[PDB]
Nucleic acid binder design. Sequence first.
RNA 1: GGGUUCUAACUCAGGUAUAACAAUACCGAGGACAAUGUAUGGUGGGUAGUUUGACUGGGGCGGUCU
RNA 2: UUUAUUAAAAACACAGCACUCUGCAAACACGAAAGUGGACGUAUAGGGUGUGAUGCCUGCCCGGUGCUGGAAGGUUAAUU
RNA 3: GGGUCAGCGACUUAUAUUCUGUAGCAAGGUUAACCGUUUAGGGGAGCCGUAGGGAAACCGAGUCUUAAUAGGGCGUAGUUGCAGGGUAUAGACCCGAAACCGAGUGAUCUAUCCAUGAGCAGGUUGAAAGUGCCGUAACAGGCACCGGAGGACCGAACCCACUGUCGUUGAAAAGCCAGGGGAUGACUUGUGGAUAGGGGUGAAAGGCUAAUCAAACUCGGUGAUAGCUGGUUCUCCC
RNA 4: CCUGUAUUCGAAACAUUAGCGUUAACAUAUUAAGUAGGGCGGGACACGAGAAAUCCUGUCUGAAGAUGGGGGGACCAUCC
RNA 5: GCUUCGGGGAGGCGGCAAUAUCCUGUGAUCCGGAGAUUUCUGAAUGGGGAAACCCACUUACCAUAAGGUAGGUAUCUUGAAGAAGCGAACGAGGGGAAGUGAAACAUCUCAGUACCCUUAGGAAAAGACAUCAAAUGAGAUUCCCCAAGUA
Lengths: 49, 44, 76
Amino acid sequence: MQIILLQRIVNLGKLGETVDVKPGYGRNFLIPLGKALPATAANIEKFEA
Amino acid sequence: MKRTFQPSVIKRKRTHGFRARMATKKGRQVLARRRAKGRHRLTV
Amino acid sequence: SRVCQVTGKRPMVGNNVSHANNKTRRRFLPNLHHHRFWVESENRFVRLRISTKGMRIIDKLGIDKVLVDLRAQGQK
RNA sequence: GGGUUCUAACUCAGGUAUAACAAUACCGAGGACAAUGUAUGGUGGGUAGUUUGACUGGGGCGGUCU
RNA sequence: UUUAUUAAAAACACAGCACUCUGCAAACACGAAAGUGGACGUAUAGGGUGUGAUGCCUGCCCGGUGCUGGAAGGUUAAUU
RNA sequence: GGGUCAGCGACUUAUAUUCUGUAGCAAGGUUAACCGUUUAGGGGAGCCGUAGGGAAACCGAGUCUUAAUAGGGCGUAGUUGCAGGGUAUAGACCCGAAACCGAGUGAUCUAUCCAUGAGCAGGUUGAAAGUGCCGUAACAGGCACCGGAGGACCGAACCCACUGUCGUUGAAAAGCCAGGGGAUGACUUGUGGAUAGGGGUGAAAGGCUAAUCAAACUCGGUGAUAGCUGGUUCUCCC
RNA sequence: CCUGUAUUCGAAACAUUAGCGUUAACAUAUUAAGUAGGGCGGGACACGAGAAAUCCUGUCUGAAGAUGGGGGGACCAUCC
RNA sequence: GCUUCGGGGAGGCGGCAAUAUCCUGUGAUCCGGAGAUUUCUGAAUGGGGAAACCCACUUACCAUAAGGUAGGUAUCUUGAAGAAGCGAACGAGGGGAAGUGAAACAUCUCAGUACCCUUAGGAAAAGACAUCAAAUGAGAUUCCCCAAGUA
Ligand SMILES: [Mg+2]
């Protein structure tokens, strides 16, 4: 799963970095609790802007 | 001695009657079959 | 029933084949699971009975796309 | 290359609210187990489908069968 | 109690006994599942099995086949 | 095997294929589906025959095998109808199982259960508890009264079915008569309901599940299959 | 001889069939990714796993995207 | 059986099946088109139910008594409109035997048949090449005759 970081979290990357996580890690924790977004163009534009 | 047929109207109408036939899909097929044979007695 | 909503997966019929080639009828069931999907666009969790392939389709297309396709399909 | 811990998936045939059932929310307890799909080894008269020869001073037993 | 309609019994049941399972979403059973019974019960309970009031009692054998525990080693599936 | 008579009752149909006869054409024969103002006329696709040998490539009155040019093997009037005999696939001469499978119908009989009602003449026995008096250090213990237990007793209704006679084309597809057992209980019984076929239910007999039970009934697969049994219809000639 | 037959023929009303016109309902992609392909288990192909192409998919995966892709019965190259 | 519009022209009031009272050139009976009426049950639809029954609620009006007339009141789907149920065969689709044959029988056959279930239309389905071919190439689907009982 490719995701943009919305905040620093250990062992994964900096703020705004697009990283690869296990789908369960992305789908069940980070995105639902607002620590990341799915890596789509419509999301990278939203974050970059 | 006691024989096999012991008549009861409520029991007859409740196991074999018209509304008992119409309550099931298989009872409605019984009725469709009786009507296709043209029986003058649909249900007891 | 035991049907995936998003992919349409349902049980398949087939044969159990023995080493002596005896055939018995069998079913192949979908890998169906209950999952609560977070939807930001509605700020809520929606629980779906979904297949693993459907979860991958959520991953690739988005819960919003899958949800609008289900709503167009009917049951919601 | 194994454990330990965590919680956020998942589970509750727990509590409270929603009339009731159920679902949902929260709390609580568990928790990457359990459980289920696919595949796979084992077990499996619980259940099925069948087989279980012929000769023969009746048949079986014995013997025989090239 | 039983072979309605050739067998009523020494057969079945029985109170009692023993083994064994089951910690509760129990084991177990019906069911494809949901849902049920067990039980709105909880190990002094519930299931299965044998035996069959009571009295005196119930010896030896764990090689076979089951069951229970153990895992050092041998062998061993899919997969890779 | 047949009481008798009358009536009906068994080698078919379709296609493929082979042989025979017959007819037409003849080294050729013949079209199919179709079209057609339809038995015609058209339609040559195809099929059979006209060559075989060899697994085959390949060659061909030859070819194969072989190193062999030897030897040896195999080779050197049909066709289309019509009719008939046989065969093949179909129920395939007709009738006949015990079965197996699918889908329904049944617990008004019976088995067990659930709910809700009802019944059990009459006569007995006399458990615990209780009371009193005595007794004991106190419990204990005794005696009398009293009480009314019990899958208790005797015995009608009711339920049952041990013995015998009768009856056995019965009065009856399970009874009668005379005796017999239980008869306040694990009792009998009414009404309604529940469980359904490899399923149920069973104080267990493979019992019962509508006079049907080692797998109900009905319909369907189905004209099951039957190396078996029975039957198979006019006449004469060799 | 009668009803008929040959032939010729009728419709106030309603239906049906067509052609035309018009209305109101729905529809109107723009070139295609969880797709093609692959592993495992099945199924369908005349083809019973077979040297088995091709199709379908329960399970697990997963492209290139026209300088590309599919098929031509394992498979590779070339060609169509 | 009522009305009307057409046909028709002498009988007629359906049959068993006649009898009586009657109708009919003021055009009956009869035939064809249209309309009106159309009890109750049944999808049955206000609730219920042992079908042809029991019990209602409500709006408007009329009655004055214990009612009468005309309506409304099921569920689901879609945003008021639809649906439901029934009924030949043929279609498409979801499930799917066994007897039988193999002279036994298990692969196989039977057969994707019977049957069960879902759902259309006058047909359905399929259909325009990510199809074949390998010939001088052809040019969607369906059906028939061959190819061929061949590979
Ligand atoms: Mg009986």
